[PDB]
Design a protein around this nucleic acid. Structure first.
Length: 245
DNA sequence: CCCCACCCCCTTTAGTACTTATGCCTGGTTATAGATACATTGAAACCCCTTTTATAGGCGCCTTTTTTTTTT
């Protein structure tokens, strides 16, 4: 019959298509970590029919802010555009560079429910303000999902902003990872933005990505490489540096 | 040479107690406006001056006379 997919606890069950992913011996079903949901894009451009039981995106309005981009910023964005993950991957730029502008552009371009993963709450507030262009921070179009408050909303530069996570009963999206597709989490959001992606390689934080169906992934950072060389894992989950300056 | 254990770090956020400024309201005396004590210069309002010719009471005030009381 028609192809179908569904999300189960940070994994994607698959039916009617052997080609798309990998088969599970234990239970005859194609199963994959949530991160490899993107192969579904194969059906998209193709306009191949499938049923998407897996993704539960928060409803997202088609954003149309106007974001001006200097030339280098456009170049990086375009590199990112090629795969929006393999090509998006991570963008490395100096602090002055205006990576956030690129992020904003991707969010506008993508216009899907988005999750931003940041280290601190302050950065979260900062991002939240920028998100205002799509709809002001006061606007519903922006939300914050953390221990303090849990709001699950759509698109923006990232409609949802959350932190990497901490250790506690309640924490950031890492804790939440099964619950809602983010850079961190399960099946709510299509785009995952990692501000300061270098943090992501933490053994725990990395799960945020794996557990995520979110096809598009962007990591922003001044310095990609880690002393630990943990940075290597990013390519699979997030992507490798498609652009650097 | 490899594996396991111990030591040192930074991560940022949540708690209630303690200190400082703002608003609160509250007890003197000082600064304002007008009238009072009153005192001012101004004026009007007042009685005052010239006399007569007759009538006939009451009015007050004078010096000389008579009576009473005191002292020797």
């Amino acid at each position: 019959s028609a192809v179908i997919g569904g999300d189960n606890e940070r994994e994607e069950e698959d039916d009617d298509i052997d080609a798309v992913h990998s088969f599970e011996i234990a239970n005859e079903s194609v199963e994959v970590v949530k991160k490899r949901c993107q192969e579904i894009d194969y059906p998209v451009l193709e306009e191949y029919d499938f049923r998407n039981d897996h993704r539960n995106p928060d409803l997202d309005i088609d954003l149309k802010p106007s974001t001006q981009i200097r030339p280098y910023q456009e170049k990086s964005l375009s590199k990112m555009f090629g795969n929006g993950r393999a090509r998006s991957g991570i963008i490395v730029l100096p602090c002055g560079a205006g990576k956030t502008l690129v992020g904003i552009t991707a969010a506008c371009t993508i216009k899907k429910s988005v999750i931003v993963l940041c280290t601190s709450s302050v950065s979260v507030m900062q991002w939240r303000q920028q998100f205002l262009q799509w709809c002001t921070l006061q606007p519903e179009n922006c939300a914050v999902f953390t221990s303090d408050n849990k709001e699950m909303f759509q698109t923006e530069s990232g409609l949802v902003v959350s932190t990497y996570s901490m250790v506690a009963n309640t924490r950031n999206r890492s804790h939440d990872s099964q619950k809602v597709m983010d850079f961190l989490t399960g099946r709510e959001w299509g785009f995952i933005i990692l501000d300061e992606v270098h943090v992501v390689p933490a053994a725990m934080f990395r799960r945020v990505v794996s557990t995520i169906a979110a096809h598009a992934k962007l990591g922003l950072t001044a310095t990609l490489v880690r002393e630990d060389d943990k940075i290597g894992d990013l390519n699979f989950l997030i992507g490798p540096k498609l652009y650097e300056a």
